[PDB]
Design a protein around this ligand. Structure first.
Ligand SMILES: NS(=O)(=O)c1ccc(Nc2nc(OCC3CCCCC3)c3nc[nH]c3n2)cc1
Length: 261
């Protein structure tokens, strides 16, 4: 309930909401992280915006969703502390970087686990169980996808260039569930090719490439089937993209893909 109940270990990275640090829970020694939100400049109706969102996401529970643990207010530091599961295996962006450095494509099996488990995660957001929510992730990219010790997927974190900008957002249309699917298509594509499906140096020529909807096949190392389903998420028409259910129906997706390395 208070900062005193936790001991900061060190500081990881600083993302959107603010700083993110690894921590030990005083009472039993569990390693975790939390995320700072300085609320010190917010109003009392800018705040009301945050608190409903924070509660919505707090109810989200899934083995491939980063687990919520605690919230903490600190008037002194005017900071809101959201405490969450620590993800030992880092993020997929590092995995992609590593593939690039080593010049080694990832196994189709590893891509199939990631696709399967992010799809289960998004399904719990989009549908799910019972349940009220309907949540869209709205920021699906490798830096927001973490791995545990057995490299299982944890979906987290609900001037640069927006490679994964969907065709809806780019044509003034509201972000919908199929926009999550486009983002997943970009991520899986980049996971295979070790580069995103549309590259460019200016945003206006990236927008142009995205509008035409054309890109390289993922490497030949990968099956026609995997290329097909990823390509399907990159349909320009959102109603031509698979839903999370259609994805999971794919013959490629098997039981062993749902858990551990
Ligand atoms: N770079 S790295 O490869 O060395 C490595 C990376 C991340 C982690 N672990 C980890 N990180 C998080 O966010 C850190 C990250 C989140 C997005 C914004 C910037 C900061 C988490 N949020 C919940 N659980 C989290 N777990 C371990 C090693």
């Amino acid at each position: 309930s208070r900062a005193e109940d936790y001991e900061v270990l060190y500081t990881i990275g600083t993302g959107s909401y603010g700083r993110c640090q690894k921590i030990r829970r005083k009472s039993d020694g569990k390693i975790l992280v939390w995320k700072e939100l300085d609320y010190g400049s917010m109003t009392e109706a800018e705040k009301q915006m945050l608190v409903s969102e924070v509660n919505l996401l707090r109810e989200l529970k899934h083995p491939n969703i980063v687990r919520y643990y605690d919230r903490i207010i600190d008037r002194t530091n005017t900071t809101l502390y959201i405490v969450m599961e620590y993800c030992e295996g880092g993020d997929l962006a590092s995995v992609i970087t590593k593939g690039t450095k080593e010049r080694q494509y990832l196994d189709e099996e590893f891509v199939l686990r990631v696709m399967t488990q992010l799809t289960l995660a998004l399904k719990e957001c989009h549908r799910r169980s019972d349940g009220g929510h309907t949540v869209l992730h709205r920021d699906l990219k490798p830096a927001n996808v973490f791995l545990d010790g057995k490299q299982n997927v944890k979906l987290g974190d609900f001037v640069g260039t927006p490679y994964y900008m969907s065709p809806e957002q780019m044509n003034r249309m509201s972000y919908n569930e199929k926009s999550d699917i486009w983002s997943l298509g970009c991520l899986l594509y980049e996971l295979c090719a070790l580069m995103p499906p549309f590259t460019a140096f200016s945003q206006k020529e990236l927008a142009g490439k995205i509008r035409e909807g054309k890109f390289r096949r993922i490497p030949y190392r990968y099956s026609d089937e995997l290329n097909e389903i990823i390509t399907r998420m990159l349909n320009l028409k959102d109603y031509h993209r698979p839903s999370v259910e259609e994805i999971l129906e794919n013959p490629l997706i098997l039981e062993h893909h749902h858990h551990h390395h």
